[PDB]
Structure formats: C-alpha cells, structure tokens
Amino acid sequence: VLEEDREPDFIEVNSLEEFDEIMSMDILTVAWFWAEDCGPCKLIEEPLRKMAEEFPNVVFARVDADKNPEIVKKLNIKSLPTAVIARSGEYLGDVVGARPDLLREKVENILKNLE
Template identity: 40%
Template structure:
C-alpha cells in the first residue's frame, strides 16, 4: 500500500491603507498568522470570553494589558503591530484586545473613551493606563508593573 500525505496551505489576500493613504495589498499565510496572533494578543470576541479571562486573571499576579481599540481608529491600527511586537517581548504578560464597539460595556467599565487606550490590570484592579499611541510609555509602564 502507498501512503499519500496531503498538506493544505491557505493564504488570505488583504487590502488596506498605509500611513500615506496609499492602498496596500498583502498576502498572509493563514496558518502562521493565526498562530502568532493567538500566542501574542488575545482577541476578545464576546462577554463570556472577557469574563473568563478576567476571572482567571483575578487570582494571578500576572499583568494584564487591555488594548481598547476600534475598527475606525487610525492610531489603533498604527499601534497594532507595535503591540504585537511588545507582547512578543513579555511572554509572562497577558495582552487582550477589546473592540469598544463590540464590547461597549467592557469599554464603559474602564472608561475607555479616547483610543487607543491601554489599561494595565493586576489581580482584577486597574493599576495604570496609557491613552494614545505611545509605545514607549506603554513599555515603561509594563516594565514598572511586570514584577
């Protein structure tokens, strides 16, 4: 008998605008981009997922960084790759992205009105925040509280 092995490889083609307003097309390897995304920044899709994460973090000394964002927020899009980069350097910090339009009650709880907003939480309590696209300030605060 012959054994046949088939490997599927999928690509997603996306169009977006770069900082200069030009349309940019890029091809993403789905397998690797999904792996990377899930490993670095948790996309919070529902209240149940949020509650589960929040409850699990309450009993932990780990730092939780909540990235409040929105599809229409330009500075949020600019910060997204920087947040992934920062998350890759702090494997013991949990990063969660919350779309304020999808989970308005969570955004309301943390009064995330100006975006992007990064709320730092430890044991269920807000300990600090960074408002605006300020990666250097975000790193400084992560360094301060990541004990």
C-alpha cells in the first residue's frame, strides 16, 4: 500500500534564525550548502538524500547558498558543495567539495563512538 505524501529530501533552511535554531539542538546534524547553478552540488543531491534515509538519527539540512548568502558568510564557506557536522551549537567536522563517501564515513564514525 503506497498512499502518496513524501518527506522532504532535507530540512530546507529558509533563514539564518532557523539555521541557528537547528544547529543548536542536542542532535547530530549535517548542514550542506547547495546552489541551483553548482554542478557538483546537483551531482551529490541523490547520495545525500539516500544518506539522510540511511541515518534517521541525524538531521540533514540543506542551505540554498543563493537564497541565504548570509549563512555562507557566517561560516566563511568558500567552495560549494560543503557539508558541516554539528551538535549543540558546536562544529564537529566538515567535508569540502563533492565527497559523499567521506561525509558518510565521518557521520558513521561519530555515531559509532559517542556515549
């Protein structure tokens, strides 16, 4: 039975306030930075959608760098895509560029080793 109402691919961030609220939570969180005219960003959309399904204990949020350049500047993001890993307002690691495998490794390692 497949009644049709689909979960978002990511938490789609709409503001800097919302960003800061998400990243403040006591939940392992991945925020990744995307743009419509960034080829490598579009390249990793499906791997990151799958990764969010693979780790339901983790929040995956997407920032649209063209809509919310203030969040890009707040973290001094220089290359797209970038992913940042956070918990309770602290930054735990980043992956610069189109490297979903490295991101998955870093998330798996944090989950494996925490209390």
